[PDB]
A paper describes a structure:
Single-chain monellin (SCM) is an engineered protein that links the two chains of monellin, a naturally sweet-tasting protein. This protein is an attractive candidate for use as a sugar replacement in food and beverages and has numerous other applications. In this study, we focused on the Cys41 residue of SCM, which is a single cysteine residue present at a structurally important position. However, this substitution may destabilize SCM because Cys41 is buried in the hydrophobic core of the protein.
We first designed a mutant substituting Cys41 with Val (namely C41V), whose side chain length is similar to that of Cys. The yield of the C41V mutant was the highest among all the mutants, while the yields of C41A, C41L, and C41S were comparable to that of the WT, indicating no significant differences in expression levels among the SCM mutants. Differential scanning fluorimetric analysis revealed that substituting Cys41 with Ala or Val increased the thermal stability of SCM, while substitution with Ser or Leu decreased its stability. Furthermore, under all three different pH conditions the relative order of the Tm values of the SCM mutants was the same; that is, C41A > C41V > WT > C41S > C41L. The SCM C41A and C41V mutants were crystallized under slightly different conditions, resulting in having different space groups (i.e., P1 for C41A, and P21 for C41V). The crystals of both mutants contained two protein molecules that formed a dimer in the asymmetric unit. Models for all 94 residues were successfully constructed for the C41V mutant, while the models for the loop between the β2 and β3 strands (i.e., residues Glu48–Arg51) in the C41A mutant could not be constructed due to poor electron densities. The overall structures of SCM C41A and C41V were almost identical to that of the WT. A comparison of crystal structures revealed that the conformers of the side chains of Thr12 and Leu60 differed among the C41A, WT, and C41V variants. The crystal structures of SCM mutants indicated that the side chains of Ala41 and Val41 are in close proximity to hydrophobic residues, as was the case for Cys41.
Residue numbers in the entry: 0 to 94
Write the structure that this text describes.
């Protein structure tokens, strides 16, 4: 199951946005991008399994990179804390 909250922007969200841009630059579809900012709202999904136990998270962010707005989804595994870029699409309209 997934449960949801909005988290505020600050260094943690800035670094999620920078992670997303670095990961997208590995793929190369949009050429080389450079991070500009994360804007509100930042969604945090917590993924539960079994007896309402956290398996991991997904952060869904609007990120300006190279002056274009993208939607990035980043997974984070609870056990390992490992993060991955799941989706990076755009450009997209501002929220």
């Amino acid at each position: 199951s997934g449960e949801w909250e909005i988290i505020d922007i600050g260094p943690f969200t800035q670094n999620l946005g920078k992670f997303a841009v670095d990961e997208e630059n590995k793929i190369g579809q949009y050429g080389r991008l450079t991070f500009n900012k994360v804007i509100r709202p930042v969604m945090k999904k917590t993924i539960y399994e079994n007896e309402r136990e956290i398996k991991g998270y997904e952060y869904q962010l609007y990120v300006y990179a190279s002056d274009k707005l993208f939607r990035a989804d980043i997974s984070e595994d609870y056990k390992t804390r490992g993060r991955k870029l799941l989706r990076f699409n755009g450009p997209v309209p501002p929220p």
